[PDB]
Design a protein around this ligand. Structure first.
Ligand SMILES: Nc1ncnc2c1ncn2[C@@H]1O[C@H](COP(=O)(O)OP(=O)(O)O)[C@@H](O)[C@H]1O
Ligand SMILES: Nc1ncnc2c1ncn2[C@@H]1O[C@H](COP(=O)(O)OP(=O)(O)O)[C@@H](O)[C@H]1O
Ligand SMILES: Nc1ncnc2c1ncn2[C@@H]1O[C@H](COP(=O)(O)OP(=O)(O)O)[C@@H](O)[C@H]1O
Ligand SMILES: Nc1ncnc2c1ncn2[C@@H]1O[C@H](COP(=O)(O)OP(=O)(O)O)[C@@H](O)[C@H]1O
Lengths: 398, 398, 398, 398
């Protein structure tokens, strides 16, 4: 929840938007501007894919709201929309009921993926009918159509998968899980490519054994069950399961202490390890736990020695506006150009994240005046009603 | 007790007093002035009601006695006079016999409401008579009148509910609890609207099964009984119980440390979570537990990023007088206009809370001179007899 | 892993490259420049070999990237490519699940070698054939050729040892371990010296008892098994095993505290002890654990009294280029002279380790533009894409 | 080991070298210069011998390498070459597996001697022959010669005692320990005094009971075995054992904390206690454990009140040369006068201990150039190759 929540403001980020030369496109994969850093992340992506990252980590350094989290996430997108991305903040290690290296370990395990191939008993086909009498469904394969009667329980799941008549689905016989594959090929046009949104009519019987591929994390297995690692290694050896190290993003790196960096240095050498990407908005800091050793970003030298550092720069109000616009678009929030330009300007006086967070309040304030679009007047009101943290701390200082 | 005590100086606060446009009325729902902040809280109220507050919290920032606690409480009033409001101060986490995240957890559970529908055996009707012989009572429904004989125990409860002959009540057969519904409809005039202060004659028998609706908190269930959460979830699924997240108000936010903020960030993402409203009267502070990281209001950035910040401003002596007046009125304390004007002036030299606390001492000092109203002379004496903390610390400094 | 990883950037270091007079050669054994220090390490090497190091330790002092780790490793090379070298950093003692003197102890035991003579049942000879039917192998000795059939398990090991037809190998009958001795003498030319890359045809039978000599560390025995020390001493007394104290390199010496130095002082007097070599890039420091005692490099006087101190100096960009070149050559990375000269210059503005770490990213960036050699343009791009820690901390400071 | 190691650089120190008047001789008992302090230690020696030291301790104060450790050791020599001398440094109390007052206690017990008279079964005499056939030995007393056949075990011990034919020895029948008494009287000349290097032919039989006198410490009994103290007191009462309190030397006195000084003050009043001699190279220091109480040498007043303080002064390069010469002579290291004069000069720029430690490296560097004597050129090279701690910390500071 905190993590899905954490990644929601980045729902538009699909990758780094580079061309084949590895250079940044004007605007692609959701990203605009920040081109130098995007290109540096692309080198990281190639290094990771080449397995030339052994014992290295990444550090994104720059001010608040300069896309450090977006860029980390984009790296994981470029390895695959499948690849696990686990964002944390360093202060999360300080907790009253769990040791700090158990927090780190847990976050490591969230960042290591496993693709498991299993054969399951299913009922599958094109959904020829949905008739609540319980719900009757007809499923069609190349061999013909068969009727099922579904309990409310499986019907709810089918409704959750947004299954409609015309879709190809399967229903796992044991768990009752419903998977929507796409729309059946029968109904595709000449605009619709092969097996994408539209998929073939399944061959064979409605009721059959089907080879399914689950993407799970090593943490997702903990909750569903040391003993784990043993089974996982069995499965890889049998080519039943395949490891997929992901990305561990550690914002607020300076909140880590010496014991945390000792644990991290060691862990990131594991062959199955995720790539570790740190983020910092600070310069030189006393390394926490030492009391007097000052170091770039609060990271010990022997670690910094293995860290590839990419700088992120402040956006102009013009760049910020382009990004605020992607967020509004992605959110389904209608907003005038003048309103967006004002939000850009507010962002430059505060941060990008502050401007972005004003969209939802401005939108509701628009709805309340019977308007279905944010206008400049609503941005103006909202920004007089609410304060950024720097402005508020300053007023109260003075 | 400490919490009812905590909310007593806000007994006049009924809501935020905004119009349908969401703009502040001159004086409504007990609030006067502080209009910008009241309007910002109204946006929060709509966001909460729309469920657009996921992963956000609120921060009220301003000096002492600028209505931060009043405004938080007003938000809970606007969600419902039913909705749980739990005020705490951050230093309450530091306690010798309970861990700091057990304090926070307990305060979370006080801030989550549960409406439970139950059917109980009752005796109900209009109270046709009260005759202490034990006490004889006649209860009347549409089917007729029946006599009961009450033990002192239930009579005491009935007396506590301020039940008079003419009122419609019920008496729970098992617990012996007495509920006063209102005055019977039979005696209402043409000024008295339907089922308000005045309620219908109940239909059916005096003795019957009645569907009652209890508002409890998750903390109120702890005391009357992990195992709880299980039963509660059962009841929601059965539509027997309904959750009502309330408001958790955390004043003195800078007294929280890093472990507290890690626990809070996580907790406030729970789907059943109350809205968290922080309050601060400070500017930049070392985040407690870090020793060197300075931050607006002593809150870590990753939290501040999710916090909507509303500023509260100092009242003029004129505004303060309006508020001191509401408090006197609400208290039943008679006071001259000149006395109120003096209290306004004292408030500007000290704080609003200091002026407000002088009413009760001034009133007693009035009674002692045979006066049934506070006059300027009594405010003058009281303010020479007692000191505000700033004045006292200064005298002793010097 | 962290340790093999730790020694990888020094894979070119074969010794100290001194002549018989003990003076530094222009460039030999992988080292270039740093001649004074290399000559001082050569005195240490002779002292150790003479056993005149009793109760002394070594300190390498100089800035980051001046070869302190290389020189320590080179000392161990000069005692033997066999001699254990264990590099650590002082902050590694601070760990959440292991005491600080258990870290030190473990690192001591990694730095003490044991040569064990054992007689094992083997199959050996020249590999006359490799035929996967399982894999058939013919092994030839002076007495003739014998066929074996190997399971996939031993075949994998043989493949790991890079065994080819024509090589002399042995296969341990019990463990199944494969050892490649070299190419058979039969196929050597007049350029190929006796028993080096090329080794004799083994005498006797394919199947025989063979005296093998394993080099292990005292830590390598822990993992494969107090009780250990007892057995080890038995074996030395029987001339079955022979001790070989190695080198313990402790970088970041100032991260050690007083309890660590008390433990180290004592341990390094053990007769079986490794030589301890410290490294420092700092001047006077508060001795950690004391709060107020300042001392050269953060080391207590009574220790400093027993420490032989060798200074390492900054390389010019010209020297740095020579070293960057050895690393590229050793890596198999093609790079123009102009590109190397630029990396030298970058190294002088940053450190040698930063320049060296740019090779792999520059190389991949070269491959991506279809180039099989790094050119100046790729060094330029790479250095604009990535930042050194000093530059990044400075930008964010300002 | 650490302690024998600790006393090795003082192997030339035989006493304080004073005349009968108690005044310092130019050069005697290994000491040169430092005359005032030597004379003050001589008063201490007489006070101790008179038992007028009850509740007093000694403090040697002066810079590094001014002979504080030498002088402490010399005091113990003057009480007897037998008398236990236990040197420690105050930071040794801070250890992870032993409490700080258990370190102190252990060091107290090392500093208390016990002379035990025992009668043992022995074989003794003049060694008339050594014939390895096992080894045959003939032992001769006044009653005649007897042959023994020794196992390798006792022969090794005899070889360790440097026993030659012509020496008078005994061999303990039970333990197998070999003691070399000296050369037999039969072979002495008129230059050789009675019972010194040369001792009489033993009277009686080869095999006999012999009264032997072992010098042990109370710590030496711990390792070979509270219960101890009981037995020891038994033996003193029986005149079987005799106590000999020694000297406990505590360098780095300012590393002791308040709990250590409380334990020490108390312990040094024991009747069996060693004399405690502290050493300091510092002026006023915060007493460790107090945070704010400043005191000469970091010692509490009530202790300082009982401490007799002797100052040690810096040596000139001329005095230092005399001392460097004694060390070379004692070591068997040949060195020119010019080389010694250079070492004196180096010592004045650094410390005496630094110059002294350059002898062994300079000597090896001499051997390497085929020279059997250190010449100025070798001192020059060695001092350019290695650095003193002050010089190294300074370079790296700057
Ligand atoms: N170059 C960019 N293109 C598109 N979106 C961006 C870009 N940079 C930042 N963002 C977005 O702007 C918001 C703030 O960026 P974020 O990654 O949180 O910054 P940081 O982590 O540096 O504080 C996020 O919603 C993020 O997705
Ligand atoms: N705008 C307002 N209208 C009515 N009452 C107010 C207003 N602001 C503050 N109060 C009341 O004044 C007193 C002080 O305000 P409070 O909410 O405690 O201030 P704070 O929490 O900022 O110190 C309380 O009794 C409160 O109910
Ligand atoms: N004189 C030298 N000759 C060859 N390689 C060197 C030399 N000095 C340093 N190196 C190499 O340069 C890199 C940096 O040196 P390193 O030993 O890590 O420096 P330090 O430990 O002082 O920071 C390593 O790859 C090392 O092998
Ligand atoms: N006056 C002296 N005569 C002979 N040797 C001395 C004299 N002073 C010091 N030494 C010797 O010089 C070296 C340094 O002296 P040491 O006792 O360790 O000094 P400190 O303990 O004050 O640092 C030792 O080898 C010691 O035996």
């Amino acid at each position: 929840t905190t993590k899905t929540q954490r990644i929601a403001s980045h729902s538009h980020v699909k990758g780094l938007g580079l061309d084949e030369s590895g250079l940044a496109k004007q605007a692609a994969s959701g990203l605009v501007g920040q081109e130098n850093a995007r290109e540096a992340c692309g080198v990281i992506v190639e290094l990771i894919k080449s397995k030339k990252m052994a014992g290295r980590a990444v550090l994104l350094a720059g001010p608040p709201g300069t896309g450090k989290t977006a860029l980390a996430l984009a790296i994981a997108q470029e390895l695959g929309s499948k690849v696990p991305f686990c964002p944390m903040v360093g202060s999360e290690v300080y907790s009253t009921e769990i040791k700090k290296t158990e927090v780190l370990m847990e976050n490591f395990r969230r960042a290591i993926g496993l693709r498991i191939k299993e054969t399951k008993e299913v009922y599958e086909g094109e959904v020829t009918e949905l008739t609540p009498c319980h719900v009757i469904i007809g499923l069609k394969t190349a061999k013909g159509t068969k009727q099922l009667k579904l309990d409310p329980s499986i019907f709810e799941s089918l409704q959750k998968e947004r299954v409609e008549a015309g879709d190809v689905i399967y229903i796992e016989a044991n768990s009752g899980a419903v998977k929507r594959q796409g729309r059946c090929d029968t109904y595709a046009t000449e605009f619709d490519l092969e097996a994408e949104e539209y998929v073939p009519l399944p061959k064979g019987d409605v009721h059959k054994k089907k080879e399914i591929i689950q993407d799970v994390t090593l943490h997702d297995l903990d909750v569903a069950n040391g003993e784990i690692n043993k089974v996982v290694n069995k499965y890889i050896d049998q080519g039943i399961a395949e490891l997929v190290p992901g990305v561990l993003f550690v914002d607020e790196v300076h909140m880590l202490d010496i014991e945390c960096f000792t644990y991290l240095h060691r862990a990131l050498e594991s062959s199955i390890a995720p790539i570790v990407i740190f983020a910092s908005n600070r310069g030189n800091c006393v390394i926490r736990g030492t009391e007097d050793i000052t170091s770039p970003h609060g990271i010990p030298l022997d670690l910094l020695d293995r860290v590839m550092i990419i700088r992120t720069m402040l956006y102009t109000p013009q760049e910020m506006k382009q990004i605020i616009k992607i967020r509004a678009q992605t959110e389904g929030i209608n907003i005038s150009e003048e309103a967006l330009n004002h939000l850009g300007e507010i962002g430059t006086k505060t941060t990008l994240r502050y401007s972005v967070q004003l969209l939802t309040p401005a939108n509701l304030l628009a709805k309340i005046n019977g308007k279905d679009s944010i206008e400049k007047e609503h941005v103006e009101e909202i920004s007089e009603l609410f304060y950024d943290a720097k402005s508020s701390a300053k007023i109260l200082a003075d």
